[PDB]
Design a protein around this ligand. Structure first.
Ligand SMILES: Nc1cc(F)ccc1C(=O)O
Ligand SMILES: Nc1cc(F)ccc1C(=O)O
Ligand SMILES: Nc1cc(F)ccc1C(=O)O
Ligand SMILES: Nc1cc(F)ccc1C(=O)O
Lengths: 265, 268
């Protein structure tokens, strides 16, 4: 991978692997989300970051994902090459946004797009806050100055408030626990694991006959290594829509909420 | 990747990704086992077994047969760091008509030093009935021409760890992780639990104090029975000793053994 000519975006090609595909021999959405994270991390490395700035490290601040929105038009097949371009944009005092564009490396067609909202958090107190002027000045030089949105519609085609699923849920997967492979290098549960846990409660008949087109996921709290999660889903709807909720079974504390849109194959 | 000069082995380079590394910023053994599967699959494609099957041959597809791991043995001397390039060479060889073996050699791409070695044994399973069967003469004849004729072993030395018989762990186990269940990401393209998931499940019962102070050097894992998508697994471990452990994976519903193995850990 490499920064683009103007140094304001980053591109990388990936060859879809045997273990990265599902039953239809195309990449799973969790493989797509892993590749989004990888190209994002390579972009941060290319501009000198490690995603904190010098001022952020001094004040004990970290970036944390508040929302993830992914839309897939075609999933790349096993052995296909997918090219991903990523960039970051300032949202003033609110936080930052990272967008992605997936393309078929052979035809150049846009096969998918994604957007994510990031907020600042004190690493000690775990409390969110607004971005100061000094933090903003350290990374604004790495962002396009004029707006560049992956989703012109509303910077995610579901900017809407995701409501909280009401008990009883229509479907569920109870007692989900992370294993050591679900942890990142900092010993925290990888953000993509939560996508897998949401999708565990979708009925098999839908998975076998439909393809996932859209996923919007809010991140509220983290699941720790010793926590246990319940995944709850209710149909809200050729197209099938679902409302999702992830909560800790120990006390019912919400960790994530989301929505999914599926299209009949 | 590409076939080697004589066309009897295959090589591929991999750049270690951010999410593929553990606490010390080096590749996990589950990432290594995933790369072993990937280079094996690319070797199958390079010799004419297309992406319409999971490295199965024409006769296998016709008879509804798939590949099944019987044993996996991996030895790591140095784990590649995040962003490092590891080169893996793989080859296949029949052991008369009793075994089908796939071996691997892992190397530092720049210096050429051997950083790891692995060996595996394979049998076939009917994808519908799930009944196992040894590799048949017709299936063998389809890939024999792509295998080295003279013996070629990742572990040629006498009394090497790869040939060790593994005993069955006695109850009570010293340590355990109970109630492990696969999720959809643990399934391969044939909707079976991926062989690497069992490696993760074995290692789940290792205590944190060992993980924090030691590095995994050797893992030998026998595969006796498959864990189905609706099964629940208990992972049991006992210290046999460097630290050595004896492992057992069994279904919690009836105690049926699915795997047994051993691990060797070196102090940091
Ligand atoms: N993890 C999943 C679960 C489903 F039910 C369907 C798709 C996926 C996926 O990761 O693509
Ligand atoms: N804010 C950023 C913008 C970029 F383009 C790349 C990295 C960061 C970061 O904060 O790590
Ligand atoms: N999955 C693991 C669990 C452990 F306890 C130690 C190492 C690994 C690994 O995958 O390398
Ligand atoms: N059995 C094999 C031997 C090779 F040399 C390469 C591929 C296979 C296979 O079964 O896919």
């Amino acid at each position: 991978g490499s920064l683009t000519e103007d140094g304001l975006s980053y591109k990388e090609k990936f060859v879809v692997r045997s273990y990265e595909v599902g039953s239809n021999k195309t990449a799973t959405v969790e493989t797509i989300a892993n590749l989004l994270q990888e190209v994002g991390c390579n972009h941060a490395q290319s501009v000198g970051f490690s995603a904190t700035t010098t001022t952020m490290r001094k004040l004990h601040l970290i970036w944390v994902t508040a929302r993830m929105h992914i839309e897939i038009y075609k999933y790349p097949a096993w052995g296909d090459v997918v090219e991903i371009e990523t960039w970051c944009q300032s949202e003033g005092r609110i936080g930052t946004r990272r967008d992605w564009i997936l393309k078929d490396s052979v035809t150049g067609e846009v096969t998918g797009r994604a957007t994510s909202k990031w907020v600042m958090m004190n690493q000690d107190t775990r409390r969110l806050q607004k971005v100061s002027d000094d933090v903003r000045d350290e990374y604004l030089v790495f962002c396009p100055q004029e707006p560049r949105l992956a989703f012109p519609e509303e910077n995610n085609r579901s900017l809407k408030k995701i409501p909280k699923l009401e008990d009883p849920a229509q479907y569920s997967m109870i007692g989900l626990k992370p294993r050591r492979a679900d942890l990142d290098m900092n010993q925290h549960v990888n953000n993509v694991t939560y996508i897998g846990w949401v999708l565990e409660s979708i009925p098999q008949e839908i998975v076998d006959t439909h393809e996932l087109q859209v996923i919007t996921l809010d991140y509220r709290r983290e699941c720790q290594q010793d926590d246990v999660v319940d995944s709850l889903t209710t149909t809200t709807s050729n197209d099938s829509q679902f409302l999702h909720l992830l909560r800790l079974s120990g006390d019912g504390q919400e960790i994530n909420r989301g929505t999914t849109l599926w299209r009949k194959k």
